Design a protein around this ligand. Structure first.
Ligand SMILES: NC(=O)C1=CN([C@@H]2O[C@H](COP(=O)(O)OP(=O)(O)OC[C@H]3O[C@@H](n4cnc5c(N)ncnc54)[C@H](OP(=O)(O)O)[C@@H]3O)[C@@H](O)[C@H]2O)C=CC1
Ligand SMILES: CCCCCCCCCCCC(=O)OC[C@H](COP(=O)(O)OCC[N+](C)(C)C)OC(=O)CCCCCCCCCCC
Ligand SMILES: [Zn+2]
Lengths: 240, 115, 124, 359, 181, 112
């Protein structure tokens, strides 16, 4: 039944000068880089008709396929035992207006089987449809519904495609780069009509674009080479 | 999982003629529900004008030539119908849709700041 | 009047009064910036029609206060070091050169430093 | 409404004030003016305040009912609609309601009298004191509102004080004071369309024989906008009314079918005919028993007077606005009191007029 | 372990004297704390009235005045470059081997071969025409075995515990607690 | 590309009829000697002849009714900008960047 200690007063460790090793954080992914490279090539060899190219970054493997190669590669990665990606976590997009097909549709698959994640990238334009993966993954029903709402991508084969985020009868797809961040209209309560009405946008304080004062010097270099020494073409050695 | 009421599958049509049959079919579906649109949305105008303004918006796109433009304008064509039937829009939105409204002389625009 | 109340001056002309609500600040009559809106014009507005101007915020003008400080005088050195008299709770440390025969104010604090040998001319 | 309430962005007043507008006319825009709507918490004030504040015109709203003014602020942006507590038995408050203004509007008026104010003190005393103070406060334009039969010779007290009220304004403010004489204004929650919809209307036959001309409350609100923003309307008198002639007895019955209300209308008390000497007596008693404004004696005399049009005054064609007929607007203002919903267009309403008068 | 702890060993207010004996006689579990913190212990020197003079911590290699060149520890600019392997480079690696396991001739004869895969080479053709041992050695693994998806955590394993060890719900409740192993 | 893609973007009609966009490459700033902000092509919209900026009466803000005032697009090839402008049916005009003329600079030139 001893009285409780006063934890404020108990002695604390004494340290002199602290030492912590400095080493490149990208080194600890070295083993993961080779194994994704091998398994990335394996998918390409199995399906040369579809896999345009594959890429590895640290611990993330990406497979680049055409829109017409989507259902095939998705099915292969779902059913093949060596790569059982039953769970699709994310369906999204990104806008790069400089490219001919601006939208870049990206899928993230999870394999609870082997504890792995794979990424599928497939492009799309404003008018060209993309196959819907809803027949394979039911979890993409709303992720495709969201991508259309914010990017206007036509998804072929979706059972019920409609707005999910923006208001009903909202004009324009917000995440397209050409859509201004403040939109086009705004609402207020009109006394005469006894109802909330839309009016064209008019900001009391116009948005200030401080992004113009960005860096005029390039800030990060060319990077470093971390490709496994088993995935570089050998240099033909000079002759005697 | 099952789709909601008045839903349709999203298929990219590849024939021009096939689309017009869908386009013409959809037009009566708008026309058929016009009285219910007034009743459900408590519109202050008779259903005749509701049928009147539906037709105009179809013609606005009549002269598109390229096919990929035709589908997307049809894909979004169905979506606006589906929301209207299921009472998803509020009364404020529908009123303002049909409550919408000659340009001033050069002096008049100049006098008031123009654009 | 409205002549001093609407134009900025380095120093005022008449003695400021704390009760006069038309002054720019309770301890200064005229504004201290060329683009500062006079307080007389600011309160001549519809939104002040039924207000109590004595209870609106009237902080003491900082220009008049800072010139009430004495000039620091440095002995046998032409460079003064100022840090806001708080170290880690002041401004960054800035070194002031006192070769010219005048009092050079600090960039942040506004304290004026000079040389002791120059005090007699400065105090004229 | 539209997109810009002005015809020009620079507007010089009678007093040498140069008002420069900024913006496109939306919420964040301004017009440079500063009005003062008296009785903005009244029926007509709410529409008038809303239109002015909708386009960035600062509006000072003197009020006495603290809660009734709260909903006025939604119409204007930050700092636009300002509130000044006042009482017409207080002069200092009125001299602050008009201190910074460039337009003064006077919607204060009554057809009933109270234990603290009579009709003489309100329709005549208040308007006079406003114009006297608005003149000494250097206001360029004053707009006044009176009844539709302003006639200082009328035996009715309402048109006796409303008619004299016109004079004492121009005799106080001067020969620049505009005057507006709207017809019975119909709108949502309007005093006119109310008693037509009220079920237990005691003395219906006595009250509803009076004939008037319907007029849109919004058009009256929009008309007042055109008057304030135009300097060519100074000293002019406006008689605002509609074209088609309607009688309350016609309306009280045309309304009856839209409401869809056999034995019931007689049993429910919809028809409550009354000998006139009783009505003069019961309305006499409620002046000092009821704590609320009831249908009083003076209002009874008005039921004996049809609307008169003073043809020497102006109309909506002077403002380039087409008056709106009650045919197209009666239905949307009875939907609150109202298978398939039965919708009446202009043709449906006019045909319904035929049925009422057909025996 | 997380075994039950006597009430007087927890920093909450507890009764004393006759009421302690009443509290133990009537409560279901006598070692349950009221939850009201000890006034004399909890936050007693407030955060604004402490005694510790804080000093900025600095590990030596990255905070030193010496042997502390920034380019040694400038990891943000040593990021891994983005390399995409198209079908052509896979074919070149497949046919010619890798940099570690060369299968290319030397000198100008080799420079002839590398230039072959410097332009488009579809991988469908490459697998059709190459030694079957190459696939079993380069593309596939362990003598023709497939390539299983790599694991993000080679140390992710689980094992079944029991209530005498995990302390949670007994065997009857419909959940099982998994350890690391 | 050739399609009238603007009919699916839901953008207001005024960007086609009433506004003018500009395709330009940002110029080098005189103050600084860096040459990196001048390597990507950008699209910006012209300001409005009235209602671009006006002073808020109450707090002195900068009110605006231009919903494209803070919209700048980025590209990496000139053609992609022109193609994208063509796709949306924008009434653009291209601003060709100036090219600095090469002049060799020698240390010895100060005396020769
Ligand atoms: N259909 C109609 O409404 C018609 C009305 N008119 C006249 O238009 C004028 C405006 O009335 P309207 O808006 O339509 O409806 P109201 O009768 O409700 O408006 C009366 C206004 O005057 C104010 N008022 C009355 N007495 C006082 C007082 N002692 N002190 C301060 N304010 C007072 C009221 O303030 P508060 O609200 O706080 O009580 C109210 O704002 C009236 O004179 C009316 O006779 C003429 C033709 C048609
Ligand atoms: C129980 C007593 C009821 C008194 C109500 C009353 O007397 O109310 C009636 C009178 C009249 O005034 P009003 O109601 O404002 O008139 C407005 C209503 N009209 C238009 C119908 C006239 O009021 C008074 O003189 C109140 C004096 C105080 C009385 C004691 C309380
Ligand atoms: Zn300093």
């Amino acid at each position: 039944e001893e009285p409780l200690p006063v934890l404020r007063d108990l002695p604390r460790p004494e340290y002199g000068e602290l030492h912590a090793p400095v080493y490149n954080p990208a080194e600890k992914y070295k083993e993961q880089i080779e194994e994704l490279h091998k398994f990335g090539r394996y998918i390409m060899g199995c399906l040369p008709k579809f896999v345009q190219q594959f890429s590895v970054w640290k611990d993330e493997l990406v497979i680049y396929v055409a829109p017409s190669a989507l259902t095939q590669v998705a099915t292969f990665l779902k059913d093949h035992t060596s790569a059982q990606f039953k769970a699709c976590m994310d369906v999204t997009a990104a806008d790069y207006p400089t490219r001919t097909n601006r939208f870049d549709v990206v899928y993230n698959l999870l394999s609870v089987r082997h504890n792995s994640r794979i990424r599928i990238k497939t492009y799309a334009s404003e008018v060209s449809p993309v196959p819907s993966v809803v027949p394979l993954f039911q979890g993409a029903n709303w992720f495709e519904r969201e991508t259309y709402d914010l990017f206007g991508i036509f998804f072929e084969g979706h059972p019920d495609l409609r707005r999910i985020m923006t208001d009903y009868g909202f004009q324009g797809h917000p995440l397209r780069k050409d859509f201004p961040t403040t939109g086009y209209t705004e609402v207020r309560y009109d006394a005469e009509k006894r109802r909330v009405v839309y009016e064209p946008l008019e900001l009391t304080q116009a948005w200030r674009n401080f992004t113009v004062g960005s860096s005029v010097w390039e800030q990060v270099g060319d990077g470093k080479d971390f490709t496994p020494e088993s995935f570089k073409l050998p240099t033909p050695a000079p002759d005697p | 999982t099952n789709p909601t009421a008045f839903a349709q599958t999203t298929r990219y049509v590849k024939d021009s003629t096939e689309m017009r049959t869908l386009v013409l079919n959809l037009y009566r579906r708008y026309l058929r529900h016009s009285r219910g649109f007034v009743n459900n949305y408590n519109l202050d105008i008779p259903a005749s004008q509701v049928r009147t303004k539906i037709r105009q918006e179809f013609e606005r796109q009549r002269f598109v030539k390229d096919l990929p433009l035709k589908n997307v304008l049809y894909m979004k064509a169905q979506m606006e119908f589906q929301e209207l039937v299921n009472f998803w829009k509020q009364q404020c939105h529908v009123m303002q849709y049909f409550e919408s409204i000659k340009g001033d002389s050069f002096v008049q625009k100049f006098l008031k700041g123009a654009q | 009047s409205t002549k001093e109340l609407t134009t900025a001056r380095i120093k005022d002309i008449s003695k400021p009064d704390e009760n006069n609500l038309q002054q720019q600040a309770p301890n200064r009559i005229s504004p201290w910036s060329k683009s500062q809106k006079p307080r007389a014009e600011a309160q001549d507005n519809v939104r002040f029609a039924v207000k109590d101007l004595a209870k609106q915020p009237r902080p003491y003008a900082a220009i008049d206060l800072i010139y009430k400080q004495p000039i620091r005088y440095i002995e046998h050195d032409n460079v003064a070091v100022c840090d806001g008299n708080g170290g880690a709770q002041g401004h960054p440390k800035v070194y002031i050169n006192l070769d010219q025969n005048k009092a050079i104010p600090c960039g942040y604090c506004g304290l004026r430093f000079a040389q002791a040998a120059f005090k007699e001319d400065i105090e004229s | 409404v539209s997109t810009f309430p002005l015809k020009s962005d620079i507007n010089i007043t009678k007093s040498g004030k140069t008002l420069l507008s900024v913006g496109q006319g939306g919420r964040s825009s301004r017009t440079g003016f500063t009005a003062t709507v008296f009785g903005g918490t009244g029926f007509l004030g709410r529409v008038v305040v809303s239109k002015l504040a909708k386009h960035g015109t600062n509006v000072v709203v003197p009020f006495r009912n603290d809660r009734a003014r709260r909903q006025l602020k939604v119409n204007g942006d930050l700092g636009v609609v300002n509130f000044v507590e006042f009482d017409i038995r207080n002069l200092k408050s009125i001299e602050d309601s008009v201190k910074y203004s460039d337009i003064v509007i006077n919607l204060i008026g009554t057809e009933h009298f109270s234990k603290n104010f009579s009709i003489e003190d309100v329709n005549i005393g208040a308007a006079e004191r406003i114009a006297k103070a608005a003149k000494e406060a250097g206001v360029s334009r004053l707009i006044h509102v009176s009844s539709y039969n302003a006639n200082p010779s009328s035996s009715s007290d309402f048109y006796a004080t409303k008619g004299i009220g016109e004079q004492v304004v121009r005799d106080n403010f001067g020969p620049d004071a505009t005057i507006v004489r709207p017809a019975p204004m119909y709108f949502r929650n309007s005093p006119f369309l109310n008693e037509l919809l009220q079920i237990k209307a005691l003395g219906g036959n006595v009250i509803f024989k009076k004939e008037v001309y319907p007029v849109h409350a919004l058009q009256v609100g929009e008309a007042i906008e055109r008057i304030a923003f135009d300097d060519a309307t100074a000293g002019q008198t406006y008689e605002l009314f509609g074209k088609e002639r309607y009688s309350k007895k016609e309306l009280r019955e045309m309304i009856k079918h839209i409401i869809h209300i056999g034995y019931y209308p007689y049993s429910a008390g919809f028809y409550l005919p009354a000998p006139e000497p009783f009505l003069y007596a019961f309305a006499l008693i409620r002046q000092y028993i009821s704590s609320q404004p009831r249908f009083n004696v003076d209002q009874l005399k008005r039921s004996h007077i049809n609307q008169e049009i003073d043809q020497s005054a102006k109309t909506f064609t002077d403002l380039g606005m087409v008056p709106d007929e009650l045919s197209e607007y009666l239905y949307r203002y009875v939907k609150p009191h109202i298978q398939n919903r039965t919708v009446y267009s202009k043709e449906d309403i006019e045909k319904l007029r035929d049925y009422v008068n057909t025996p | 372990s997380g075994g039950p702890v006597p009430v007087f060993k927890k920093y909450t207010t507890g009764s004393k004297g006759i009421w302690e004996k009443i509290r133990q006689l009537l409560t279901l579990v006598p070692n349950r704390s009221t939850g009201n913190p000890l006034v004399k212990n909890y936050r007693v020197p407030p955060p604004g009235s402490q005694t510790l003079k804080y000093k900025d911590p600095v590990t030596i290699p990255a905070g030193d005045i010496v042997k502390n060149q920034y380019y040694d520890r400038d990891h943000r600019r040593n990021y891994p470059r983005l390399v995409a392997f198209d079908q052509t480079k896979v074919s070149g690696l497949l046919t010619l081997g890798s940099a570690q396991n060369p299968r290319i001739s030397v000198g100008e004869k080799g420079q002839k071969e590398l230039a072959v895969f410097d332009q488009s080479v579809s991988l469908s053709s490459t697998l059709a025409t190459i030694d079957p041992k190459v696939v079993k050695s380069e593309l596939l693994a362990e003598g023709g075995s497939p390539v299983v998806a790599p694991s993000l955590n080679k140390k992710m394993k689980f094992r079944l515990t029991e209530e005498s060890e995990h302390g949670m719900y007994p065997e009857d409740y419909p959940i099982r607690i998994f350890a690391q192993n | 590309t050739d399609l009238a893609k603007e009919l699916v973007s839901g953008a207001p009609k005024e960007l086609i009829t009433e506004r003018v966009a500009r395709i330009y490459q940002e110029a080098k700033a005189a103050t600084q000697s860096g040459q990196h902000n001048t390597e990507t092509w950008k699209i910006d919209w012209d300001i409005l002849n009235k209602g671009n900026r006006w002073e808020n009466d109450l707090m002195g803000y900068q009110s605006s009714s231009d919903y494209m005032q803070g919209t700048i697009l980025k590209f990496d090839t000139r053609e992609g900008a022109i193609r994208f402008a063509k796709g949306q049916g924008w009434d653009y005009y291209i601003q060709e960047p100036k090219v600095r003329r090469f002049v060799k600079k020698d240390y010895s030139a100060n005396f020769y």
